[PDB]
Design a protein around this ligand. Structure first.
Ligand SMILES: N[C@H](C[C@H](Cc1ccc2ccccc2c1)C(=O)O)C(=O)O
Ligand SMILES: N[C@H](C[C@H](Cc1ccc2ccccc2c1)C(=O)O)C(=O)O
Lengths: 258, 258
């Protein structure tokens, strides 16, 4: 019965992969997505996140999903306990998925410099499972390559190659700790080898959403969505581009100023 | 960090399959299981369930799982909204799993006479997804066959055969709507044919538990369980038997009188 949309707060266009996963897994659910392209330390990030949470709230969402790994690591738990509606991040489900797929216990997590600096993935993994060895590594060149949509670029494959070098042959499972990275998946697989299982946090988060939607009895109509709404705090046009390619369809973005 | 056990309230020994699923999927979690073998209408079942909930509560559980389809259908939602700790049933996750696996939209759910009379599975399936055709059918001879542990019995296979006749070739997916039935799985598959996907509610419930344990940040120690405790309101010895076979190990049952 609940026709209210699920809200997504991202730091830019990265979270959009989480969205493509939702549309893929729960075609009937409606979406409210706000990506704070503009703006860019920690305490300051909480403030920014809250601004985006309040907006999602004024959009009557039944749920809020932190599609941003950094935001999750900094405010997720706080915002989660301060609201009555469900709030989940992409970090925990990716860590839990990794914990369960590790064969030897040597886990590698890559991601944004800030996500890695927050060291959230390590702290969660070794909190639920202390014995597992976690190896984190920032890949600052990955995000720019994705937004360029030049993944097949042999120039890109080199960056992926050189960037992962430090982890090659040292881990049994690698966590794509940035929602941008699922677009570099094939390349990442090759560079690591078929012996390394890759965990897509965003995708693992969507699989958690259905379970949560059930548990809190707030599902939408399974046979009916189309009323999707996207908000960005800057670069509305470049946003439409990237978003229209990943979601394979032109989408209407609305320039917002919180 | 949460070392509190997960509580299981069953109507007898059936729920034990849900337990074997937990032990299988989350070996580290601890268990408190109460099966009300004694006692046996609707309003009266709520009272009985509550008695078992209060007991589980006096056992300091961090979660309560209705391992009984009938109890779930009658009190789950009530007890769930009256407690601060998480409470999930086996019905919803089995219905949601069926909704998602149905190819044509012709779903068949079997189970206990009471579960079927409650018509809970139909109501939930056509509530979340109105267009799906749901065909329910009581198999009162199934439970007795399982407790006898004579499944390979050609006499049993006949009962399974004749009991499912009404659904054969009329559904694309069949829901094992009784926690007892997973033990008759092979037989049930043959009688339906490889074109029918079977949904094991109990198993689908356990897969939901991990997601919930995460969400409510109440996981136990992943590397440590052994402190499992079983309580039955009658027939403690016959209980030890059945339980020791399904769980492949002698287990200590405690005769309780709520
Ligand atoms: N996800 C990266 C940017 C983030 C930075 C960032 C992290 C959190 C934010 C929260 C609210 C508004 C803006 C934010 C920006 C990162 O490097 O981890 C990107 O989309 O380029
Ligand atoms: N699960 C069946 C018994 C149940 C009956 C039943 C249903 C709910 C109960 C709740 C509390 C105490 C006893 C109960 C007994 C059924 O037929 O659906 C069995 O184990 O034989």
């Amino acid at each position: 019965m609940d026709t209210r949309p699920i809200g997504f707060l991202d730091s830019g266009v990265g979270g959009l992969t989480v969205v493509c996963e939702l549309i893929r897994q729960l075609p009937h659910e409606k979406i409210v997505y706000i990506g704070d392209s503009a703006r860019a330390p920690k305490k300051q990030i909480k403030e920014y996140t809250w601004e985006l949470v309040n907006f999602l709230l004024t959009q009557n969402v039944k749920m809020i999903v932190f599609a941003c790994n950094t935001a999750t690591a900094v405010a997720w738990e706080e915002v989660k306990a301060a609201l009555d509606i469900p709030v989940l991040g992409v970090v925990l489900p990716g860590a839990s998925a990794a914990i369960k797929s590790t064969t030897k216990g040597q886990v590698g997590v890559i991601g944004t410099p800030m996500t890695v600096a927050s060291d959230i993935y390590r702290k969660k993994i070794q909190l639920l499972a202390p014995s597992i060895q976690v190896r984190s590594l920032a890949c600052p060149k990955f995000v720019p390559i994705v937004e360029s949509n030049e993944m097949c670029s042999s120039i890109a494959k080199k960056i992926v190659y050189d960037s992962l070098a430090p982890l090659v042959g040292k881990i049994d499972t690698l966590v794509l700790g940035c929602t941008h990275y699922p677009l570099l998946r094939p390349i990442i697989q090759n560079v690591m080898g078929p012996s390394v299982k890759l965990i897509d946090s965003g995708a693992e988060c969507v699989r958690d959403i259905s379970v949560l939607l059930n548990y809190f009895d707030i599902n939408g109509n399974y046979h009916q969505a189309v009323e999707h709404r996207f908000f960005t705090t800057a670069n509305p046009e470049i946003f439409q581009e990237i978003a229209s390619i990943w979601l394979k369809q032109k989408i209407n973005v609305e320039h917002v100023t919180l």
